[PDB]
């Protein structure tokens, strides 16, 4: 029982053709904020 990481969160300091879709993709490999 353990976690293989699915995502990493980086800053902006620590760093067109056609689009398949017009709205962004909420991935399931990402936590979401809970109100």
């Amino acid at each position: 029982a353990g976690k293989l990481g699915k995502f990493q969160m980086l800053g902006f300091q620590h760093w067109a053709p056609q689009k398949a879709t017009n709205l962004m993709v909420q991935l399931l490999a990402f936590y979401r904020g809970k109100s």
């Binding site: 056609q18 689009k19 879709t21 017009n22």
Partner: protein
């Protein structure tokens, strides 16, 4: 005049979620494609 075997040909047409983004001979068998034009 269309038989039910012919409406199924008209039913099996392409319907696309969309986008988001003369009969001439060939002398040669070479084709260049550019943005979906042959």
């Amino acid at each position: 005049v269309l038989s039910p075997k012919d409406i199924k040909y008209i039913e099996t047409m392409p319907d696309y979620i969309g986008q988001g983004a003369v009969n001439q001979n060939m002398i040669g068998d070479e084709i260049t494609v550019r943005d979906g034009t042959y």
